[PDB]
Amino acid sequence: SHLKSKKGQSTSRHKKLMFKTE
Amino acid sequence: SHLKSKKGQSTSRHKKLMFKTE
Amino acid sequence: MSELEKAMVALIDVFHQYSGREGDKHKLKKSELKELINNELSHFLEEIKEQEVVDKVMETLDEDGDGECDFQEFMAFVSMVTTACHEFFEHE
Amino acid sequence: MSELEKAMVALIDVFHQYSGREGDKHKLKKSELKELINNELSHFLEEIKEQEVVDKVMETLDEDGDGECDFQEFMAFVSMVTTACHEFFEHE
Ligand SMILES: [Ca+2]
Ligand SMILES: [Ca+2]
Ligand SMILES: [Ca+2]
Ligand SMILES: [Ca+2]
């Protein structure tokens, strides 16, 4: 509900490395 | 009190690497 | 070929290039850490364009929670990213 | 010299020597793990004389708690031991 999807923004690239975290 | 010191035994070498753990 | 010995020495060698760059020779600041990632990994890894990405990575590598990852903390970030390399470097 | 790319490839190369040794090519069993440590590190690291030492290390590397550390789990054990190498290999 209060969570922010934050879709878009190239910064998402960080999430690609998060698959390692997890 | 119920803890086992387990002094001696070369196996202690493992504890040397435990400094990394922590 | 049991060449694990040369691999550990090389991993430490790159770390000295950036750590000795600034006064934090024995410690890395999220700022110095960005230089290692953006400048050293010009094409090997996706360069960082925003320092905010480094702040998020700091949550993971800032184990001491001091905004600075120690050389021991930096070492762990190299093992996890390499694992990703296995998917790309599939010997097969 | 930004030679981080050759270091990641070498770290993975030694892992293939033991993982392909037995059927667990994509996984390492506390048994296969002992061979990596005792046989590959004949003198580079203190060889293991008892498998019990490997059982204790399994508590740390058996992240999945299956008695087997996956290649990703094995990778993390190499970064922490290397840190010890920095104390011994003080460039400086
Ligand atoms: Ca530094
Ligand atoms: Ca820290
Ligand atoms: Ca195997
Ligand atoms: Ca496991």
CATH number of the domain within which D17 lies: 1.10.238.10
Task: Please tell me the distance from the alpha carbon of residue C92 to that of residue D2, in angstroms, as a whole number.
Answer: 26
Give the nearest chain D residue to C75 (CA atoms). Answer: D79
- With 0-12 / 13-18 / 19 or more C-beta atoms within 10 angstroms meaning exposed / middle / buried, residue C13 is middle
Is B11–D80 a contact, with Cβ atoms under 8 angstroms apart? no
Q: What kind of experiment solved this structure?
A: NMR
Identify all chain C residues contacting D3, using CB atoms and an 8 Å cutoff.
10, 13-14
User: Using alpha carbons only, how large is chain B's radius of gyration in Å?
Assistant: 10
Q: Does B1 touch chain D (CB under 8 A)?
A: no
Is C40–D76 a contact, with Cβ atoms under 8 angstroms apart? no
User: Smallest Cβ distance to C50: which of A11, A16, A21?
Assistant: A11
| C-beta of residue C16 within 8 angstroms of C-beta of residue D91 | yes
CA of D37 to the centre of ligand 3 (A): 13
Tokens of C61: 């590598």
Give the nearest chain C residue to D12 (CA atoms). Answer: C86
Secondary structure (3-state) at D27? strand
User: Using alpha carbons only, how large is chain C's radius of gyration in Å?
Assistant: 14
Q: Give the minimum alpha-carbon distance from C46 to chain A in angstroms, rounded to a whole number.
A: 8
CA of C35 to the centre of ligand 2 (A): 17
Q: Count how many pairs of residues, chain B against chain D, have C-beta atoms within 8 Å.
A: 20
Crossing angle of helices C51-61 and C71-88, rounded to 10°: 110
Is A13–C53 a contact, with Cβ atoms under 8 angstroms apart? yes
Secondary structure (3-state) at A8? coil
Task: Please tell me the distance from the alpha carbon of residue C14 to that of residue C27, in angstroms, as a whole number.
Answer: 14
CA angle in degrees (0–180, nearest 5) for C60-C25-D76:
35
Domain carrying residue D60: 1-92
CA of C22 to the centre of ligand 1 (A): 5
Give the nearest chain D residue to B18 (CA atoms). Answer: D57
Q: Which residues pair with C21 in a beta bridge?
A: none
CA dihedral D45, C88, C84, C87 (to 10 degrees): -80
Q: Which residues pair with D29 in a beta bridge?
A: D68
Is C57–A14 a contact, with Cβ atoms under 8 angstroms apart? yes
Tokens of D6: 């050759």
Q: How many CB atoms lie within 10 A of CB B14?
A: 18
Secondary structure (3-state) at C29? strand
How many distinct structural domains can be found in chain C? 1
Task: Please tell me the distance from the alpha carbon of residue C36 to that of residue D55, in angstroms, as a whole number.
Answer: 36
CA of C29 to the centre of ligand 1 (A): 7
